[PDB]
Design an enzyme around this catalytic site. Sequence first.
Site, PDB file in Angstrom:
ATOM      1  N   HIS A  94       0.544  -1.165  -0.181  1.00 18.77           N
ATOM      2  CA  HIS A  94       0.074  -0.346   0.041  1.00 18.77           C
ATOM      3  C   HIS A  94       0.813   1.553  -0.092  1.00 18.77           C
ATOM      4  O   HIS A  94       0.723   2.158  -0.457  1.00 18.77           O
ATOM      5  CB  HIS A  94      -0.814   0.248   0.851  1.00 18.77           C
ATOM      6  CG  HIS A  94      -1.155   1.204   1.545  1.00 18.77           C
ATOM      7  ND1 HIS A  94      -3.129   1.615   0.459  1.00 18.77           N
ATOM      8  CD2 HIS A  94      -1.305   2.349   2.342  1.00 18.77           C
ATOM      9  CE1 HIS A  94      -2.865   2.993   1.020  1.00 18.77           C
ATOM     10  NE2 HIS A  94      -2.776   3.105   1.983  1.00 18.77           N
TER      11      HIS A  94
ATOM     12  N   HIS B  54       1.049   5.419  -1.895  1.00 16.90           N
ATOM     13  CA  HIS B  54       1.211   6.418  -1.364  1.00 16.90           C
ATOM     14  C   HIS B  54       2.296   7.542  -2.587  1.00 16.90           C
ATOM     15  O   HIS B  54       2.684   8.782  -2.755  1.00 16.90           O
ATOM     16  CB  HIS B  54       1.547   6.580  -0.295  1.00 16.90           C
ATOM     17  CG  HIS B  54       0.556   6.243   0.147  1.00 16.90           C
ATOM     18  ND1 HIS B  54      -0.237   7.859   1.014  1.00 16.90           N
ATOM     19  CD2 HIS B  54       0.406   5.619   1.234  1.00 16.90           C
ATOM     20  CE1 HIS B  54      -0.932   7.119   1.509  1.00 16.90           C
ATOM     21  NE2 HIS B  54      -0.791   6.248   1.773  1.00 16.90           N
TER      22      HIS B  54
ATOM     23  N   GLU C  21      -6.048   9.683   0.221  1.00 14.14           N
ATOM     24  CA  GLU C  21      -6.399   8.146   0.808  1.00 14.14           C
ATOM     25  C   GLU C  21      -7.828   7.350  -0.701  1.00 14.14           C
ATOM     26  O   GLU C  21      -7.244   6.540  -1.047  1.00 14.14           O
ATOM     27  CB  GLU C  21      -6.882   7.799   1.980  1.00 14.14           C
ATOM     28  CG  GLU C  21      -5.813   7.509   2.839  1.00 14.14           C
ATOM     29  CD  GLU C  21      -5.310   5.908   2.344  1.00 14.14           C
ATOM     30  OE1 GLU C  21      -5.602   5.052   2.065  1.00 14.14           O
ATOM     31  OE2 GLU C  21      -3.391   6.349   2.982  1.00 14.14           O
TER      32      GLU C  21
ATOM     33  N   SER D 287      -4.296   1.123  -4.246  1.00 15.21           N
ATOM     34  CA  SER D 287      -2.886  -0.301  -4.221  1.00 15.21           C
ATOM     35  C   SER D 287      -4.531  -1.639  -3.757  1.00 15.21           C
ATOM     36  O   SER D 287      -4.539  -2.162  -2.996  1.00 15.21           O
ATOM     37  CB  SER D 287      -2.417  -0.092  -2.580  1.00 15.21           C
ATOM     38  OG  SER D 287      -3.710   0.390  -1.773  1.00 15.21           O
TER      39      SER D 287
END
Length: 308
Positions: A169, A174, A214, A233
């Site tokens: 993730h 990110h 997010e 992700s």
Amino acid sequence: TVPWFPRTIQELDRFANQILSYGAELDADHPGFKDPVYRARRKQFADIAYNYRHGQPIPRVEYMEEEKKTWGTVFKTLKSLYKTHACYEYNHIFPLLEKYCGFHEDNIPQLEDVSQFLQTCTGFRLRPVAGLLSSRDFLGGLAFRVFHCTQYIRHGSKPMYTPEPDICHELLGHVPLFSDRSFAQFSQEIGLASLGAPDEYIEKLATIYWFTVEFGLCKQGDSIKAYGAGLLSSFGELQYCLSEKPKLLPLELEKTAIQNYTVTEFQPLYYVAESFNDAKEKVRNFAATIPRPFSVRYDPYTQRIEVL
Ligand SMILES: NCCc1ccc(O)c(O)c1
Ligand SMILES: [Fe+3]
């Protein structure tokens, strides 16, 4: 009185003694709960994070073959979607991560190499994090362009599922966005608005963070693309978020700040940003309404916050 916040980048070291000590892998529900090797491996990554101090190189770890196999499965399956679903900034940088950071199916990139690459692009750096930081400490790190990043990987029994952030993730979700200068300035503005803010506003900023960093969608040409780490992700939600099913609304902070969300199913609704520069402006305006008896500025030359 005004809650404490770090004034220099080194004071971020004070967060290690403020994480949730009883993490998700201790729940009977976790995919790796009955596996003692996984449990010991998590403790091992937690000890690395605990002892880490600002300025030290992030320790390199030799991942096991079982861990590399989980990484490879996630990487190959998600990679097929980026060309059509991910925002332009993500696709622009991905080849460079493949060439200089080792992003490949057969190798888990080491955090130190990734952090150095980010430093060269926008001055962002990573630091390993043990477990769950409070929203206040997590957002405060962003004010210094510091992203607290997990170094462990999800349990191999369920490669396409994780109940918490793990390294897949962080790296696929990110990292690519933190390479973009405008996204970097936008993230940092969220962190700066958080310093010394009252708890009830920290929760508003954490909700804004959730609907942008997010789970954000962004306008690109006449199209819409994903830039949220949690979408980038997640194989299933990335396909779902650009279909006709979810409700899409323009990013309006007063409204986004109080919106409820769930962490367990696909989001019923997403906010769309016009661009990262625009979102950055909206955060700066929103920060002006937070009751703080002072003002803050980051000085990149000395890595300190100036309180005006
Ligand atoms: N703070 C709640 C957990 C959390 C916080 C930040 C993230 O980037 C993430 O993926 C998950
Ligand atoms: Fe995340």
